[PDB]
Structure 1
Amino acid sequence: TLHISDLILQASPVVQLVMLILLLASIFSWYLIAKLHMSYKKARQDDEHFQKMFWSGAELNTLYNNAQLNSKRSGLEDIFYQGLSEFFKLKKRQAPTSQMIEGTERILRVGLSRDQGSLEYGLGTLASIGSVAPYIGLFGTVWGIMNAFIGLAAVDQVTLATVAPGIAEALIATAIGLFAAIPAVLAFNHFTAKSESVYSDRALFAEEMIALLQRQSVG
């Protein structure tokens, strides 16, 4: 006649605090998963849109004008526009093509690093939560068992009916810790895989852009 809620509402203060921290960590992790999933979906959609717009065969300058007229550009549009704008910044001056190519590479690397840093917002937070939730839950379990045994060690001969439901309260600490750690680990692995995929795609596009610029610039 015992419920999980009946275990949660009454316990020692320490394990209750531990379970509260684990619940808050789980809620925070779910919020971060939702937000970062939305961000990755938007980034992927913008990436594919830009690839189809670029390799359509339209003039490179016309793509620059399209970037200029757009204000909401964030992804491959934005980094592409920075790169090409800096490239024409050196066409309007006089300089050899080699160091212009190096500068375009530098600005593309800066852009990729900036957008990737702003894109993986709280991935390290998920890493930390998934790494320490089981440890906090296990500490709660250890403290609950310790409190149960110290409270019931000299009161005559204790019966299973007197020690079992405090062991239950100790165990629920690590149960909640694993429940708050499963989403964190899953989302961290999946989302770092997606981050690697997106960054690889962006780097390959940057290399192809340098190839096209070099080929058209040498003449």
Structure 2
Amino acid sequence: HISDLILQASPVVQLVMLILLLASIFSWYLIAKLHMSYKKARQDDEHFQKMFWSGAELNTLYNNAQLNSKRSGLEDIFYQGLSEFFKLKKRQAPTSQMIEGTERILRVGLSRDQGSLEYGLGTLASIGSVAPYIGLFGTVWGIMNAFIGLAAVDQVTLATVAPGIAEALIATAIGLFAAIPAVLAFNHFTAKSESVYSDRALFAEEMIALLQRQSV
């Protein structure tokens, strides 16, 4: 029956209800994209991180990464890091400089891949914050195309207004239904984003340490 009400409403409330059902649908597409992105990230980070803290030397690891054309996440942040370090050593620079250099070009890798994991995470924040109040605008337009209507009729039976009051609440309900899934995913992926940054940041620190020692 609810389907019927949405079909037979003021043009304005109907546009609010499309703006919001599209926000709902886009929310859900982003929540699928962000979930895939942050599962690939977590998986490849564990794979590389394991292999790096496995016996095989830095040089060995660097060889493989250079060979792979599918370098992604930590593996690419590592390749870009050591690429700098090897490129400097060849120019017989001081260790102090070599480390400082390699530590700049992998803060310029852990920040240029955070940006590409958090693809839609800001949109979900908007959808989540605005959408409730797009709904509310629909509600107010609805309650205000009752009372504007009520004046005209001979008799103010509650039954006169009520069909119009419903078509208001529908819009605020749709508003809350667009907004809730998108503030339980701007919350869950903002968390997963800080986890992955921290995991990779602490791996970067621990890789630096290795290089300083392997130097002296």
- Structure 2 equivalent of residue 178 of structure 1: 176
Residue segments in structure 1 that go unaligned for 5+ positions in a row: none
Cα displacement string for residues 98-155 of structure 1 (whole angstroms, at most 9, x for unaligned residues): 1111111110100010000011011110000100011000010000110111011142
C-alpha separation in 1, matches of 2:77 and 2:44:
12
| CA deviation after TM superposition for structure 1 residue 157, in Å | 2.3
Q: Which runs of 5+ in 2 are unaligned?
A: none
The correspondence of residues 43-82 of structure 1 with structure 2, limited to 5 A, is 43-82=41-80
For the residue of structure 2 that corresponds to 1:172, the secondary structure is helix
Identical columns (%):
100
Q: Structure 1 residue runs of 4+, over 4 Å off?
A: none
User: How far apart are the structure 2 equivalents of 1:155 and 1:28?
Assistant: 42
What secondary structure does 2:93 align onto? coil
CA distance in 1, matches of 2:121, 2:57: 38
Q: Distance in 2 between matches of 1:26 and 1:211?
A: 47
Deviation of 1:91 after TM superposition, in Å, equals 1.0
Instruction: Give CA-to-partner distance per residue, 1:154-185, whole Å, 9 cap, x none.
Output: 42221122110110001100000001111100
* TM-score (norm. length: structure 2): 0.98
**Whole-angstrom CA distance in 2 between matches of 1:60 and 1:113:** 23
CA distance in 1, matches of 2:117, 2:101: 24
Measured on the aligned residues, the alpha-carbon RMSD in Å equals: 0.7
CA deviation digits over 1:61-97, x for unaligned, max 9? Answer: 0000011111101111101001001100011111111
SS, match of residue 57 in structure 1? coil
Q: Which residue of 2 aligns with 1:30?
A: 28
Instruction: Say which SS state the counterpart of residue 119 (structure 2) adopts.
Output: coil
The SS at the match of 1:171 is helix
TM-score normalised by the chain length of structure 1: 0.97
**Matched positions, count:** 216
In the alignment, the residues of structure 2 paired with residue 106 and residue 44 of structure 1 have an alpha-carbon distance, to the nearest angstrom, of: 23
Alignment partners' CA distance in 2, 1:199 and 1:132: 28
